[PDB]
Amino acid sequence: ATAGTVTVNAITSDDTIDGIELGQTISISGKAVGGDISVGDVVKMTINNTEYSTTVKAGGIWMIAGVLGSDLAADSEFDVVVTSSDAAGNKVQSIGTSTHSVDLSAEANFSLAEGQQHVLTNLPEGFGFPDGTTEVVTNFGGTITLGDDGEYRYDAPVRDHGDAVSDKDSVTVTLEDGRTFTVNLDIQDSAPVAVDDQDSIVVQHEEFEVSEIAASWVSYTHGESVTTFDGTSDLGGVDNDSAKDQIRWGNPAESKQSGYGFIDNDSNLEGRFDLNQDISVGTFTHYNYPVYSGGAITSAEMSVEFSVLDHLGVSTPVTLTVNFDHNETPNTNDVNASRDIVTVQNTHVTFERDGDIYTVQIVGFREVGNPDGEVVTSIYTNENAATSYELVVRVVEGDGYSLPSTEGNIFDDNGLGADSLGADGSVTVVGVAVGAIVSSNESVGHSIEGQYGNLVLNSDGSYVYDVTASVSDIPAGATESFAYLIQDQDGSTSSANLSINVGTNTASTPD
Ligand SMILES: [Ca+2]
Ligand SMILES: [Ca+2]
Ligand SMILES: [Ca+2]
Ligand SMILES: [Ca+2]
Ligand SMILES: [Ca+2]
Ligand SMILES: [Ca+2]
Ligand SMILES: [Ca+2]
Ligand SMILES: [Ca+2]
Ligand SMILES: [Ca+2]
Ligand SMILES: [Ca+2]
Ligand SMILES: [Ca+2]
Ligand SMILES: [Ca+2]
Ligand SMILES: [Ca+2]
Ligand SMILES: [Ca+2]
Ligand SMILES: [Ca+2]
Ligand SMILES: [Ca+2]
């Protein structure tokens, strides 16, 4: 007898037994056609040592209604044997072969925040732990725990999200029936949250009633033909007192003598000083002439003498001594290098008024008629020229060792809550800037300039802010704002604003 063709269809649509199919009944079908195969012939196959049988139907179709999933999972290859006859009774066997895959795995992917506990939802169908097991440990040492309430919870470890080691955690559960479930847990980075900070500072305002200023050149070192005198039309201009505001030196190599002149600011001040205010005590002029060498001073001292009045009418005499270093430089054909240079020293005098102490301090030189100009301590003057600057002082409360200050820490609750640190910790300040915008920069633990003062903010959040502006430049709105950036151990960053209200109190010791 002629053998026919036995074919076996795919064992399920994808030709693989999976974890769900494992617990089910599966139909197996095929064909048996040609040769001496007839409708009615016996079809047999052994799958995992159980025999399944059927007959060939019309058109050569055969099917087996219920093969166990568990049998096909145990045996991925088998023969189908069809037994046929011809008209004369000669037996023949036709043989087909089937193979399929067995993949009893299923996966579950999650993306979850570090350092938190999470309920795992939408687990694959049939998911569970083998009998007795309430906890499995993940590759990173976390756990998936089965609770009283039937829920699966994952304790996500904290990870270094910046390093060279992947933060995709994993665990495989294996069941007795051969199923596995792989849970992949992509651990997501956490970040600190910086919270805005508020601070304030009030600068004091007080008015002082002052006498006229008398300024005198009182001493000097080195120089030839040194004279000091009350200024005149020709030499220095006039002032309202007989104190000696002019000094001249040198043997003139061209026309006149070099020197200094100081014209007090008596008429603009109108007998009042303000506290915490840059005040010009007068105009300093440097007259630079060519003089033969050895003729010039190297320093000179000026006494600035005035009286301050108190609410009971008692007067305190005050003397501020101002020292200037002078460099009458060798003249060459280089104009810039030929300039003569004057440096004022940062002196002060402290006086008492109504039981409080106040300190008059030299700030330096400022351009004439430019109250908001840069203040310098050295000035440079060309040969055959005179420069003029305002000599600026400031009167402060106390011993003058410091400016009005406020301190704090940006990690504290400064009116809106403490900064949140996140799960990674090791948070530090890594950037600070005046304005709204900050990145990690090189200003942390440095002094930086605000609108009205300077800030030092350190990496641990501690800051000191001090008001450098004069009271006259502090409007009633006045706010400073500095942005800072914090960063955690693997680089996550957050910014917030340190806002400082800078007030002025205009009221006095009235009650
Ligand atoms: Ca399948
Ligand atoms: Ca099942
Ligand atoms: Ca036949
Ligand atoms: Ca087999
Ligand atoms: Ca197959
Ligand atoms: Ca296949
Ligand atoms: Ca990592
Ligand atoms: Ca992290
Ligand atoms: Ca404060
Ligand atoms: Ca005067
Ligand atoms: Ca005079
Ligand atoms: Ca004078
Ligand atoms: Ca000169
Ligand atoms: Ca010179
Ligand atoms: Ca803060
Ligand atoms: Ca982080």
Side-chain angles (χ1 to χ4, degrees), residues 194-197 409-412 414 417-419 484 496-497:
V195 177
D196 284 353
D197 305 290
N409 190 295
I410 56 66
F411 297 113
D412 296 340
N414 300 122
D419 291 3
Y484 70 92
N497 268 264

PDB file of all heavy atoms in Angstrom, residues 194-197 409-412 414 417-419 484 496-497, ligand 15:
ATOM      1  N   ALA A 194      14.223  72.158  46.651  1.00  0.00           N
ATOM      2  CA  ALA A 194      14.574  73.413  47.311  1.00  0.00           C
ATOM      3  C   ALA A 194      13.308  74.271  47.493  1.00  0.00           C
ATOM      4  O   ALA A 194      12.526  74.390  46.609  1.00  0.00           O
ATOM      5  CB  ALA A 194      15.603  74.138  46.487  1.00  0.00           C
ATOM      6  N   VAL A 195      13.167  74.869  48.655  1.00  0.00           N
ATOM      7  CA  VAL A 195      12.043  75.686  49.019  1.00  0.00           C
ATOM      8  C   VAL A 195      12.509  77.109  49.318  1.00  0.00           C
ATOM      9  O   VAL A 195      13.438  77.309  50.132  1.00  0.00           O
ATOM     10  CB  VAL A 195      11.305  75.138  50.272  1.00  0.00           C
ATOM     11  CG1 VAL A 195      10.168  76.077  50.669  1.00  0.00           C
ATOM     12  CG2 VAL A 195      10.688  73.762  49.963  1.00  0.00           C
ATOM     13  N   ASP A 196      11.810  78.077  48.702  1.00  0.00           N
ATOM     14  CA  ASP A 196      12.067  79.482  48.891  1.00  0.00           C
ATOM     15  C   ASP A 196      12.242  79.922  50.354  1.00  0.00           C
ATOM     16  O   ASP A 196      11.552  79.412  51.275  1.00  0.00           O
ATOM     17  CB  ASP A 196      10.970  80.320  48.250  1.00  0.00           C
ATOM     18  CG  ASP A 196      11.084  80.405  46.712  1.00  0.00           C
ATOM     19  OD1 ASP A 196      12.065  79.936  46.096  1.00  0.00           O
ATOM     20  OD2 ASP A 196      10.148  80.972  46.080  1.00  0.00           O
ATOM     21  N   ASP A 197      13.158  80.881  50.544  1.00  0.00           N
ATOM     22  CA  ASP A 197      13.511  81.374  51.863  1.00  0.00           C
ATOM     23  C   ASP A 197      13.308  82.880  52.000  1.00  0.00           C
ATOM     24  O   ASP A 197      13.520  83.618  51.068  1.00  0.00           O
ATOM     25  CB  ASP A 197      14.941  81.067  52.119  1.00  0.00           C
ATOM     26  CG  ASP A 197      15.251  79.605  51.959  1.00  0.00           C
ATOM     27  OD1 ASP A 197      14.826  78.775  52.790  1.00  0.00           O
ATOM     28  OD2 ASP A 197      15.922  79.281  50.952  1.00  0.00           O
ATOM     29  N   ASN A 409      20.175  79.798  57.333  1.00  0.00           N
ATOM     30  CA  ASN A 409      20.570  78.596  56.639  1.00  0.00           C
ATOM     31  C   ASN A 409      19.423  78.270  55.709  1.00  0.00           C
ATOM     32  O   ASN A 409      18.253  78.244  56.144  1.00  0.00           O
ATOM     33  CB  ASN A 409      20.848  77.431  57.617  1.00  0.00           C
ATOM     34  CG  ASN A 409      21.502  76.241  56.936  1.00  0.00           C
ATOM     35  OD1 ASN A 409      20.914  75.600  56.074  1.00  0.00           O
ATOM     36  ND2 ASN A 409      22.706  75.965  57.281  1.00  0.00           N
ATOM     37  N   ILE A 410      19.743  78.083  54.434  1.00  0.00           N
ATOM     38  CA  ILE A 410      18.664  77.805  53.437  1.00  0.00           C
ATOM     39  C   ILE A 410      17.968  76.473  53.569  1.00  0.00           C
ATOM     40  O   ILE A 410      16.837  76.300  53.030  1.00  0.00           O
ATOM     41  CB  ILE A 410      19.048  78.140  51.962  1.00  0.00           C
ATOM     42  CG1 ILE A 410      20.315  77.433  51.464  1.00  0.00           C
ATOM     43  CG2 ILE A 410      19.253  79.645  51.831  1.00  0.00           C
ATOM     44  CD1 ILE A 410      20.235  75.935  51.348  1.00  0.00           C
ATOM     45  N   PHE A 411      18.583  75.538  54.303  1.00  0.00           N
ATOM     46  CA  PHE A 411      17.912  74.247  54.592  1.00  0.00           C
ATOM     47  C   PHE A 411      16.854  74.352  55.689  1.00  0.00           C
ATOM     48  O   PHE A 411      16.053  73.477  55.803  1.00  0.00           O
ATOM     49  CB  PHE A 411      18.900  73.123  54.885  1.00  0.00           C
ATOM     50  CG  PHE A 411      19.802  72.780  53.704  1.00  0.00           C
ATOM     51  CD1 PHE A 411      21.151  73.023  53.743  1.00  0.00           C
ATOM     52  CD2 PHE A 411      19.283  72.198  52.551  1.00  0.00           C
ATOM     53  CE1 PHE A 411      21.981  72.710  52.670  1.00  0.00           C
ATOM     54  CE2 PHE A 411      20.093  71.891  51.483  1.00  0.00           C
ATOM     55  CZ  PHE A 411      21.446  72.162  51.527  1.00  0.00           C
ATOM     56  N   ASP A 412      16.851  75.423  56.479  1.00  0.00           N
ATOM     57  CA  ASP A 412      15.862  75.600  57.551  1.00  0.00           C
ATOM     58  C   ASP A 412      14.546  76.035  56.979  1.00  0.00           C
ATOM     59  O   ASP A 412      14.429  76.474  55.802  1.00  0.00           O
ATOM     60  CB  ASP A 412      16.294  76.681  58.559  1.00  0.00           C
ATOM     61  CG  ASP A 412      17.578  76.325  59.338  1.00  0.00           C
ATOM     62  OD1 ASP A 412      17.981  75.111  59.427  1.00  0.00           O
ATOM     63  OD2 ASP A 412      18.186  77.303  59.868  1.00  0.00           O
ATOM     64  N   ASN A 414      12.349  78.804  56.544  1.00  0.00           N
ATOM     65  CA  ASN A 414      12.471  80.254  56.503  1.00  0.00           C
ATOM     66  C   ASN A 414      11.167  80.894  55.997  1.00  0.00           C
ATOM     67  O   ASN A 414      11.139  81.763  55.109  1.00  0.00           O
ATOM     68  CB  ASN A 414      13.692  80.646  55.643  1.00  0.00           C
ATOM     69  CG  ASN A 414      15.015  80.083  56.191  1.00  0.00           C
ATOM     70  OD1 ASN A 414      15.743  79.343  55.503  1.00  0.00           O
ATOM     71  ND2 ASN A 414      15.342  80.440  57.408  1.00  0.00           N
ATOM     72  N   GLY A 417       8.725  76.321  54.704  1.00  0.00           N
ATOM     73  CA  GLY A 417       9.091  74.897  54.853  1.00  0.00           C
ATOM     74  C   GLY A 417      10.558  74.664  54.568  1.00  0.00           C
ATOM     75  O   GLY A 417      11.188  75.443  53.847  1.00  0.00           O
ATOM     76  N   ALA A 418      11.071  73.593  55.140  1.00  0.00           N
ATOM     77  CA  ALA A 418      12.437  73.205  54.969  1.00  0.00           C
ATOM     78  C   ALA A 418      12.609  72.581  53.600  1.00  0.00           C
ATOM     79  O   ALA A 418      11.700  71.979  53.107  1.00  0.00           O
ATOM     80  CB  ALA A 418      12.843  72.238  56.061  1.00  0.00           C
ATOM     81  N   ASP A 419      13.782  72.734  52.978  1.00  0.00           N
ATOM     82  CA  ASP A 419      14.072  72.035  51.734  1.00  0.00           C
ATOM     83  C   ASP A 419      13.930  70.551  51.991  1.00  0.00           C
ATOM     84  O   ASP A 419      14.407  70.053  52.983  1.00  0.00           O
ATOM     85  CB  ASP A 419      15.516  72.275  51.248  1.00  0.00           C
ATOM     86  CG  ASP A 419      15.765  73.688  50.772  1.00  0.00           C
ATOM     87  OD1 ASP A 419      14.890  74.538  50.840  1.00  0.00           O
ATOM     88  OD2 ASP A 419      16.853  73.957  50.271  1.00  0.00           O
ATOM     89  N   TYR A 484      19.664  79.865  44.666  1.00  0.00           N
ATOM     90  CA  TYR A 484      20.636  78.831  44.914  1.00  0.00           C
ATOM     91  C   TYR A 484      20.216  77.472  44.332  1.00  0.00           C
ATOM     92  O   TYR A 484      19.066  77.216  44.150  1.00  0.00           O
ATOM     93  CB  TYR A 484      20.885  78.737  46.395  1.00  0.00           C
ATOM     94  CG  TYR A 484      19.764  78.177  47.243  1.00  0.00           C
ATOM     95  CD1 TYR A 484      19.713  76.813  47.521  1.00  0.00           C
ATOM     96  CD2 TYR A 484      18.796  78.982  47.752  1.00  0.00           C
ATOM     97  CE1 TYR A 484      18.687  76.274  48.280  1.00  0.00           C
ATOM     98  CE2 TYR A 484      17.788  78.467  48.532  1.00  0.00           C
ATOM     99  CZ  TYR A 484      17.743  77.101  48.794  1.00  0.00           C
ATOM    100  OH  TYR A 484      16.771  76.536  49.596  1.00  0.00           O
ATOM    101  N   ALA A 496      15.925  77.350  44.409  1.00  0.00           N
ATOM    102  CA  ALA A 496      14.969  78.190  45.032  1.00  0.00           C
ATOM    103  C   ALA A 496      15.618  79.556  45.262  1.00  0.00           C
ATOM    104  O   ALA A 496      16.824  79.723  45.039  1.00  0.00           O
ATOM    105  CB  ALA A 496      14.540  77.598  46.353  1.00  0.00           C
ATOM    106  N   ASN A 497      14.817  80.497  45.756  1.00  0.00           N
ATOM    107  CA  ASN A 497      15.225  81.854  45.988  1.00  0.00           C
ATOM    108  C   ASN A 497      15.330  82.155  47.447  1.00  0.00           C
ATOM    109  O   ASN A 497      14.408  81.894  48.216  1.00  0.00           O
ATOM    110  CB  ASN A 497      14.322  82.856  45.266  1.00  0.00           C
ATOM    111  CG  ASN A 497      14.863  83.209  43.890  1.00  0.00           C
ATOM    112  OD1 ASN A 497      15.565  84.232  43.697  1.00  0.00           O
ATOM    113  ND2 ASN A 497      14.607  82.336  42.941  1.00  0.00           N
TER     114      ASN A 497
HETATM  115 CA    CA B  15      15.212  76.814  51.483  1.00  0.00          CA
END
